[PDB]
A paper describes a structure:
Multidrug resistance-associated protein 2 (MRP2) is an ATP-powered exporter important for maintaining liver homeostasis and a potential contributor to chemotherapeutic resistance. MRP2 is a single polypeptide comprising of an N-terminal transmembrane domain (TMD0) and the canonical transporter core of two transmembrane domains (TMD1 and TMD2) and two nucleotide-binding domains (NBD1 and NBD2). Using cryogenic electron microscopy (cryo-EM), we determine the structures of human MRP2 in three conformational states: an autoinhibited state, a substrate-bound pre-translocation state, and an ATP-bound post-translocation state.
Residue numbers in the entry: 1 to 262, 305 to 863, 962 to 1538
Write the structure that this text describes.
């Protein structure tokens, strides 16, 4: 038919079989018009209805809107002129062809539709969308054929359609110009994020990010510069979608588990899939288009090898293949980078949905379920298992895609080499099992090794917390050796893991070499009719390069799916657990009684006895009541049951209004002290200042170094147990609730501040007078002031009444009350730690691999050329066997050098990991005490934890990957320039683009990786903090505040990760385009020089210029990764080079048994705590008698504490000297001093481990010497009770031992040492007077033969010494015997008068 639509031939293949080919005009004017117009009309009705059903308001008019609309107006006018010239010129005189009329008539209809859809677009947020952008591209790429046909016909000299040709040329020019205007963003000027307003072309090329790239280059960037994340991706948006499917599938699985057997599992993957399925479909279609286009380039490669293998194939075929190579690679790059945007965004959305669901569950999980986990083990559920589901979600499409790429590669190989490909398949089926075994083994070693790290870190945290005691006792060598041993076993595992990883990477790298050496050898040896040529060889090498990624990726997805299955069981177990039962505690307000117990019973364990048995009491408003009894009788369980933190056995409790709670064990948040007091409430100056005074807190705030704004918390300044207790009561009293529950808060503070706090805060004269207050006490001191008292016996109420009524009744209380009687030198530091001798041979082995690789490609280029000299009958068998032999030899040679390079490097990186730790630890233990006072302990721990882990884990594999990519690029550029040296002129321009794109990327990505790394840890420390605080958070009803604070943290991290993900999608567009241009210009050189080239050279060049493109990208990715991770070596190096104390042992040795008398002597002494300060102590001058007993005293701030520090040389002397037994303590080695003096520390600390190593970590004393030390300490009767005697184990900080035996055990340690000189610095805190008395008599009984110096804050502790020493302005004022010092009125007498002592 079309022959009489156009009066000319529609198709004739004899137009293409010539040097000057063109298409028939009938084909151009029909099919190449109907393609772009058919795309427009089939979809425009839907695109119009989509806007009509989603419009809100019009945008402003713009210059670009005018400019687009007027040029489509010219397209409409030209279509009218074109129809007018056909309709007037025909004059009815001849039968003009139909096409001459239909085509203009179609264009008139289309330009009216284009004006209409452009007008409709002014309601949308994104103006220039995909729909019109692909119409202009399709129109311009179809019109290009007719453009060259018309201009070539006109240039040949025919003018028969000149006017029509001009109307076409103008219409083609204006479409290119409309496409250029259609590229710009045409902003709404919304400051939120450019990605919502960006055009289709800017979106696919990520050209809306250049605004951050140009910002992060010229100056540092910060969290205010990073765009806020999209509303579809906010934590509230994701959790409210996910929870809808979670509840549905969890309830279904619960019902299925209840239908069986007559916890639920296999529901979390169903809930995730149903939440996100639409993102999976969009990702699948993009990946499938890439997996089609990846097999186009090998077919276009074969055509170019054929075009070089004869010289009468038409010249236009060569240029057309070069254009199609560039075009196919460009379309593939845009699809691939979109697929990655969707996949890496989905992995972040899955993490966010799990982390926020785990957090919200923790606030409501039952007590029986919660006891099954440690705090660190619940934090690992958010830190490890949520991250494992992200790491799998990023790559899961590789499970189907890798199989498809393998099957298509085997098909396109059978087409080139027939049945011989089965010899290559025999290699591919052997390597996949081996990689899955080595990958699951190395993952198993990595998980087992994780336990050793935790043990080392826990010991370190106790070493750095106890460092003052390690210095006093000279114990640093014992704790140094203890850490080193655990490191050795950790390094042994690290070497085995590193060796398994190096053989896995070797097999991934060599498999294309092995499979090609096997396949070409079998093909040539099996049948003498088989002869190898450039088309078969260099095409097959391209398919062997396509196979490398899917063959290595499949084993790693299999071993990762086996890991994520364990993480899924842990998440399903936790999220499926029972919610807390509220039904036994009732909040009926207006109950005319604040609290009411109805025969109730409760327990800590539903299998066990009731801990608070039948109890029946009730209490009215504004009533202060006290709870008392013997130890373990039930006291703190009564408050815990009232809060609902226990299992009900019987009855119920009723409560009226709001509650405040103070626990026996204090909970404190990271923040300022002011933030902990205000606890999310608004500030109000008068009330705030009144609370700080009432809680006796101002005397602490006067001496904390930050004042009221001091950084308290685990990552901040440390506070005493009495300070943490005051702060806890100060928080509770600021909130102003109805009911106060107190779990014996006075138990951690002295009786004088206790009396002050009782009168100010909670007594019938204090702040809380209008509030009902239930007070647990172990002390009797305040009972006379209470409204009503109850005694508990064996979990139930025994007696009740006022204080006087209990004594008048003569109950058991009346007898019991008788108890009241980037710089380059950092890279060089790391290379010297590996050692420069190994760097040389590792680099030499990597270079020899590159030379053997080049040699094997040159040999194959020679081998295929034999096919033009010989034939299937005449090829010599000696030459066949010689060609096969040395190709196998060059295949083996590069296998040997790659194995030597990888396997040697594993010993090099493990050697550096050892040296850096060994030098850090040895410096830190020698640091002076100023370092530990000025530096917060969490900072030092991070260097020993995260940094050491960075240096020994990721760092090594980044350096290996970089040198592998670098030599791959250099090897490839050498082979191209060796084949056609004119290409060296094209290398300079592309090299200037490449180094510029690297410079702009690496300046930004390094900052986003830092900004991610600093903002992630606050999520896990806040989760650890809230899980530790649950009964406090519930008692105040604060759950909604805490949920919002978690959402703010997660959203703040989420934007740093997503903008870093975007930053590497931008990079890839530029570097894949630079890569694509190397193959396009390389292909063109070999078309223009076809007279002096062969199919062998063209195959040799294009084959490895096709694999360059992903290597060009990965070299820049690794450069950013190394520049990020190398900072770990800087931080370690910083502390490795901080200052040290005086030598522990000097040649000047003290004589044998040196402290023989104890003649301590001071001359004009002077000290300051830091070079920045004036002197704390000045001009001290004294002589101390052999075995003399001394007290030191002075007005608070006298500086007394300087003596105990400087006598051990913790502080170095500013002037004067000190002597002991004729030796000056400044000349002797620092351990030879410390080890001879004996000190009892002010505050007891124990190290987690045996009773044996807590008394003697050097294992130097004998078993009976320790038993008599516990006898003299009076602990024998306790230690003999434990199943293990001296081998029994203490937990963290000794927490399984109560405070009485802790203080006593620290006295027992000193008894074993038993030296001639003893220091005592009495503490100013609460103590059990029985333990105080038995310690004080033991001091007088057992150290009778020692010289003794005592420091105390009360004169009744001093008053029986041989001498008293009084100083105030850091200078001596008086000294004498303690009666004579009172006998004449003077400094000490006035004090003793103020103390009531004299
Ligand atoms: C010299 C020889 C060069 C050596 C290495 C080049 C590239 C290596 C990348 S593999 C690099 C890959 N980029 C691609 O474009 C892969 C294209 C491939 N055809 C595919 O289908 O995936 C990629 O992983 N991109 C994701 C990203 O941007 O993070 C691997 O490290 C990815 C490992 C993925 C994994 O197992 O988790
Ligand atoms: C796949 C396309 C887009 C690019 C590859 C080049 C194409 C256009 C080339 C490669 C081989 C060519 C064919 C080779 C031989 C003949 C036989 C002759 O009697 C008619 C032309 C015909 C049938 C050619 C048509 C054009 C052709 C198919
Ligand atoms: C890519 C778009 C924008 C433009 C493409 C235009 C192409 C197809 C045009 C531009 C210049 C044209 C060439 C100009 C001159 C000659 C010389 C003549 O003896 C044969 C045709 C030939 C060789 C033309 C072939 C077609 C041609 C290459
Ligand atoms: C497909 C799109 C993207 C590009 C199309 C390019 C076409 C129009 C180009 C590419 C190669 C060109 C040919 C290259 C060489 C010759 C030989 C010369 O003696 C006459 C022109 C002729 C035959 C050209 C005609 C136009 C041509 C076929
Ligand atoms: C047209 C767009 C899409 C791509 C650009 C292709 C370029 C590189 C192609 C298209 C047309 C080609 C020309 C067409 C015709 C001839 C005449 C011939 O005796 C020498 C080569 C020469 C001079 C070609 C050189 C390369 C050329 C200019
Ligand atoms: C396998 C190992 C032991 C071999 C050692 C490789 C050495 C020579 C390589 C590995 C990583 C490299 C560094 C990686 C990144 C940068 C930042 C860039 O702006 C300048 C070059 C510089 C500083 C490189 C210098 C050379 C380097 C240190």
């Amino acid at each position: 038919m079309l022959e009489k639509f156009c009066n000319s031939t529609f198709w004739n293949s004899s137009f293409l079989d010539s040097p000057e080919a063109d298409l028939p005009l009938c084909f151009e004017q029909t099919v190449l018009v109907w393609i772009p117009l058919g795309y427009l009309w089939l979809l425009a009705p839907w695109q119009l209805l989509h806007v009509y059903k989603s419009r809100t308001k019009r945008s402003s008019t713009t210059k670009l809107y005018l400019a687009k609309q007027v040029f489509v107006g010219f397209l409409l006018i030209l279509a009218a002129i074109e129809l007018a010239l056909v309709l007037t010129e025909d004059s009815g005189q001849a039968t003009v062809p139909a096409v001459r009329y239909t085509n203009p008539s179609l264009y008139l209809g289309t330009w009216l539709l284009v004006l209409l859809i452009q007008y409709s677009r002014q309601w949308c947020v994104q103006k220039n969308s995909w729909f019109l952008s692909l119409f202009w591209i399709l129109s311009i790429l179809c019109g290009t054929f007719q453009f060259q046909t018309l201009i070539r016909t006109l240039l040949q000299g025919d003018n028969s359609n000149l006017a029509y040709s001009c109307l076409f040329f103008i219409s083609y020019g204006f479409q290119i110009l409309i496409l250029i205007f259609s590229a710009f963003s045409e902003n709404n000027e919304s400051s939120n994020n450019p990605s919502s307003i960006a055009s289709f072309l800017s979106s696919i090329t990520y050209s809306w990010y250049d605004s951050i790239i140009l910002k992060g280059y010229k100056r540092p960037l910060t969290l205010e510069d990073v765009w806020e994340v999209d509303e579809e991706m906010k934590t509230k948006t994701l959790v409210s979608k996910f929870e809808t499917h979670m509840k549905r599938e969890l309830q279904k699985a619960r019902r299925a588990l209840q239908r069986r057997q007559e916890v639920p599992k296999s529901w979390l993957m169903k809930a995730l899939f149903k939440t996100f399925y639409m993102v999976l479909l969009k990702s699948f279609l993009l990946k499938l288009v890439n997996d089609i286009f990846t097999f186009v380039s090998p077919q276009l490669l074969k055509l170019l090898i054929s075009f070089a293998s004869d010289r009468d194939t038409y010249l236009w075929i060569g240029y057309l293949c070069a254009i199609l190579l560039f075009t196919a690679a460009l379309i593939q790059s845009f699809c691939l980078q979109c697929y990655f945007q969707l996949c890496f965004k989905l992995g972040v959305k899955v993490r966010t949905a799990i982390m926020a669901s785990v957090y919200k569950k923790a606030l409501t999980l039952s007590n029986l379920a919660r006891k099954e986990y440690t705090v660190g083990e619940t934090v690992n559920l958010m830190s490890v298992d949520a991250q494992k589901l992200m790491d799998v979600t990023n790559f899961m499409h590789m499970l189907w895609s890798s199989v498809l790429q393998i099957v298509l590669s085997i098909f396109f190989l059978w087409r080139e080499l027939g049945p011989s490909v089965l010899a290559g398949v025999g290699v591919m089926v052997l390597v996949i099992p081996i990689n899955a075994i080595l990958s699951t083994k190395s993952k198993t070693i990595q998980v087992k090794n994780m336990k050793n790290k935790d043990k080392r870190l826990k010991i370190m945290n106790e070493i750095l917390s106890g460092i003052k005691i390690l210095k006093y006792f000279a114990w640093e060598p014992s704790f140094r050796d203890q850490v080193q041993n655990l490191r050795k076993k950790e390094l042994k595992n690290l070497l085995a893991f590193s060796q398994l990883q190096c053989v896995v990477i070797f097999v991934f790298q060599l498999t294309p070499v092995l499979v090609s050496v096997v396949t070409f050898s079998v093909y040539v040896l099996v049948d003498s009719n088989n002869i190898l040529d450039a088309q078969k060889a260099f095409t097959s090498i391209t398919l062997f390069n396509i196979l490398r990624f899917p063959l290595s990726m499949l084993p790693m997805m299999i071993s990762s799916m086996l890991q994520a299955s364990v993480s899924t069981e842990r998440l399903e177990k936790y999220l499926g657990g029972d919610d807390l039962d509220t039904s036994a505690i009732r909040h009926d307000c207006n109950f005319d009684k604040a609290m009411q117990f109805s025969e109730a019973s409760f327990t800590w364990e539903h299998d066990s006895e009731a801990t608070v048995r039948d109890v029946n009491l009730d209490i009215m408003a504004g009533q202060l009541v006290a709870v008392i009894g013997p130890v373990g009788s039930g006291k703190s369980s009564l408050i815990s049951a009232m809060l609902g933190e226990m299992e009900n056995v019987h009855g119920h409790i009723t409560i009226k209004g709001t509650t405040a709670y103070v626990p026996q064990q204090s909970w404190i948040q990271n923040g300022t002290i002011k933030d902990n007091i205000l606890f999310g409430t608004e500030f109000n100056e008068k009330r705030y200042q009144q609370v700080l005074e009432a809680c006796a807190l101002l005397p602490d705030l006067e001496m904390l170094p930050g004042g009221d704004l001091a950084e308290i918390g685990e990552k901040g300044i440390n506070l005493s147990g009495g300070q943490k207790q005051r702060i806890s009561l100060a928080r509770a009293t600021y909130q102003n609730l109805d009911i106060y529950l107190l779990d014996d808060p006075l138990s951690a503070v002295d009786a004088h501040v206790g009396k002050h706090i009782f009168n100010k805060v909670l007594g019938p004269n204090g702040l809380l007078k209008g509030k009902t207050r239930l007070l647990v006490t172990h002390s009797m001191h305040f009972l006379p002031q209470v409204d009503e008292i109850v005694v508990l016996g064996n979990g139930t109420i025994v007696e009740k009444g006022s204080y006087s009524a209990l004594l008048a009744k003569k109950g058991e209380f009346a007898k019991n009350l008788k108890t009241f009687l980037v710089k380059f030198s950092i890279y060089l530091e790391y290379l010297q730690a590996i050692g420069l001798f190994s760097i040389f041979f590792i680099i030499l082995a990597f270079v020899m691999n590159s030379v053997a690789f080049i040699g094997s490609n040159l040999w194959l280029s020679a081998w295929t050329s034999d096919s033009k000299i010989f034939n299937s009958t005449d090829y010599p068998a000696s030459q066949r066997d010689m060609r096969v032999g040395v190709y196998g030899a060059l295949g083996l040679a590069q296998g040997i050098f790659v194995f030597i390079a990888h396997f040697w490097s594993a010993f090099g990186f493990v050697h550096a990991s050892n040296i850096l730790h060994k030098q850090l630890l040895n410096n830190i233990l020698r640091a002076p005490m100023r370092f530990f006072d000025t530096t917060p302990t969490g900072r030092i721990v991070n260097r020993f934890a995260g940094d050491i882990s960075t240096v020994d884990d990721t760092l090594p594999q980044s350096l290996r990957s970089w040198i592998t990519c670098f030599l791959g690029i250099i090897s490839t550029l050498v082979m191209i320039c060796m084949a056609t040296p004119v290409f060296t002129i094209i290398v300079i321009p592309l090299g200037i683009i490449y180094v510029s794109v690297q410079m702009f990327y690496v300046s930004t990505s390094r900052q986003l990786r830092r900004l991610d790394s600093v903002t992630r840890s606050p999520i896990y420390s806040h989760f650890s903090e809230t899980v530790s605080g649950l009964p406090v958070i519930r008692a105040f009803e604060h759950q909604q505040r805490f949920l919002k604070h978690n959402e703010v943290r997660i959203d703040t991290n989420q934007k740093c990760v997503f903008s870093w993900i975007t930053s590497n999608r931008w990079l890839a567009i530029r570097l894949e385009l630079v890569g694509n241009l190397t193959v396009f210009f390389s292909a063109l050189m070999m078309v223009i020089y076809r007279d002096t080239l062969s199919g062998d050279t063209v195959g040799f060049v294009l084959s490895n210029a096709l694999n360059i493109t992903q290597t060009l990208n990965w070299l820049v990715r690794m450069t950013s990764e190394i520049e990020t991770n190398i900072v770990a070596v800087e931080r370690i190096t910083e502390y490795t080079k901080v200052e040290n104390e005086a030598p522990w042992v000097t040649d000047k040795r003290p004589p044998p048994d040196w402290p023989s008398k104890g003649k301590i002597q001071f001359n004009n002494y002077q000290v300051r705590y830091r070079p920045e300060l004036d002197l704390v102590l000045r001009g001290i001058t004294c002589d101390i008698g052999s075995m003399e007993k001394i007290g030191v005293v002075g007005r608070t701030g006298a500086g007394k504490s300087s003596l105990t520090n400087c006598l051990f040389r913790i502080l170095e002397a500013a002037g004067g000297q000190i002597i002991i037994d004729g030796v000056d303590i400044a000349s002797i080695g620092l351990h030879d001093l410390r080890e001879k003096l004996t000190i009892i520390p002010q505050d007891p600390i124990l190290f987690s481990g045996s009773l044996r190593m807590n008394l003697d970590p050097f294992n130097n004393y004998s078993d009976e010497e320790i038993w008599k030390a516990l006898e003299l300490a009076h602990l024998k009767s306790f230690v003999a009770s434990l199943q293990l005697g001296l081998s029994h184990e203490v937990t963290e900080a000794g927490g399984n031992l109560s405070i009485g035996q802790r203080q006593l055990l620290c006295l027992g340690r000193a008894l074993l040492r038993k030296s001639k000189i003893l220091v005592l610095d009495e503490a100013t805190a609460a103590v059990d007077l029985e333990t105080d008395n038995l310690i004080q008599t033991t001091i007088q009984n057992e150290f009778a033969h020692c010289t003794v110096i005592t420091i105390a804050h009360r004169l009744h502790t001093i008053m029986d010494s041989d001498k008293v020493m009084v100083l105030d302005n850091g200078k001596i004022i008086e000294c004498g015997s303690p009666e004579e010092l009172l006998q004449i009125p003077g400094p000490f007498y006035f004090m003793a008068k103020e103390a009531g002592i004299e």
